[PDB]
Amino acid sequence: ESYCGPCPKNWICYKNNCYQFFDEEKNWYESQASCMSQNASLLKVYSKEDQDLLKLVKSYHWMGLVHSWQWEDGSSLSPNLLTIIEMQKGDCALYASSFKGYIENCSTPNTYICMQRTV
Amino acid sequence: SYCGPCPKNWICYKNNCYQFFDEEKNWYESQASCMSQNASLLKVYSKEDQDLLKLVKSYHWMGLVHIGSWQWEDGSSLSPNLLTIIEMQKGDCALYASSFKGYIENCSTPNTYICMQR
Ligand SMILES: CN(C)C(=O)[C@@H](NC(=O)c1cc(-c2ccnn2C)ccc1-c1ccc(C(F)(F)F)cc1)c1cccc(C(F)(F)F)c1
């Protein structure tokens, strides 16, 4: 038993991370700017256990992974977290279940997931 | 602010706790499963407080049953203007589907289910 947060009211909270799904399709850069305007970043995958809700996410959504692969915050992609699969020539990646990243053209519009860490 | 309290591995949203269960069970077995977790099946009371339900994919048991109207496990009645009820099978139980639909279903049919706690 626990509390979850802190998060803004309109975000899903799970294991002290805040998540928000955006259905208006945008390219990777526009998606990044949208999350930033909400004091957040695109989804960062750092723990299969602490982010196991991602097993339930269907369809395909921008996350903050760019091409080695690294996150927006400049940190590296830890091994054993995502299976990166070629799909379209590009330097950005879409999250899909379960813990997959599909390589995609950064200019192609897609739905996206923003995330705020609380620590 | 903070959301909860909830059990550690449940989703929290606007102070309600939600858990999806992938093992298919009939309505009665699903009700017993949620009760074992000191919870109940999903109750829908507000499209605003529960707008995350717009994002739910597929069909899942909720706590709505027919006896002279539809009622939740807790005995309260279905509020008007909350769910569109759709009938394509003979039954006395209902599956939730987005967006704010209830599909009448045979209580004996195995389905995935959503538990909720508050
Ligand atoms: C992109 N989005 C939005 C998805 O993918 C959504 N996924 C499913 O709703 C979803 C898909 C499945 C599933 C397995 C195989 N096919 N499908 C559709 C099986 C179950 C669910 C599910 C059911 C109930 C709940 C609930 F009620 F406990 F919360 C949460 C998920 C989604 C992912 C993560 C969180 C949410 C939510 F609801 F919290 F906002 C929704």
UniProtKB/Swiss-Prot annotation, chain B:
Domain of life, per lineage: Eukaryota
Boundaries of every C-type lectin domain copy: 5-117
Glycan-linked positions: N38, N106
Induction per the UniProt record: Up-regulated by interleukin IL15 in primary NK cells.
Location of this chain's protein in the cell: Cell membrane
Disulfide topology: C3-C12, C6-C17, C34-C115, C93-C107
Side of membrane Extracellular, spans: 1-118
UniProtKB keywords: Adaptive immunity, Cell membrane, Differentiation, Disulfide bond, Glycoprotein, Immunity, Innate immunity, Lectin, Membrane, Receptor, Signal-anchor, Transmembrane, Transmembrane helix
MF terms in GO: carbohydrate binding; identical protein binding; MHC class I protein binding; MHC class Ib receptor activity; signaling receptor activity
Record carries keyword DNA damage: no
Membrane topology: Single-pass type II membrane protein
Subunit structure: Homodimer; disulfide-linked. Heterohexamer composed of two subunits of KLRK1 and four subunits of HCST/DAP10. Interacts (via transmembrane domain) with HCST/DAP10 (via transmembrane domain); the interaction is required for KLRK1 NK cell surface and induces NK cell-mediated cytotoxicity. Does not interact with TYROBP. Interacts with CEACAM1; recruits PTPN6 that dephosphorylates VAV1.
Additional detail: Is not capable of signal transduction by itself, but operates through the adapter protein HCST. Some families of ligands for human and mouse KLRK1 receptors have been characterized being very similar in structure and highly likely to be orthologs. In humans, an additional distinct subfamily of ligands (MICA and MICB) differs structurally, having an extra MHC alpha 3-like domain.
Job description of the protein: Functions as an activating and costimulatory receptor involved in immunosurveillance upon binding to various cellular stress-inducible ligands displayed at the surface of autologous tumor cells and virus-infected cells. Provides both stimulatory and costimulatory innate immune responses on activated killer (NK) cells, leading to cytotoxic activity. Acts as a costimulatory receptor for T-cell receptor (TCR) in CD8(+) T-cell-mediated adaptive immune responses by amplifying T-cell activation. Stimulates perforin-mediated elimination of ligand-expressing tumor cells.
Protein name (record): NKG2-D type II integral membrane protein
Organism of provenance: Homo sapiens
Residues of the full protein shown: 94 to 214 of 216
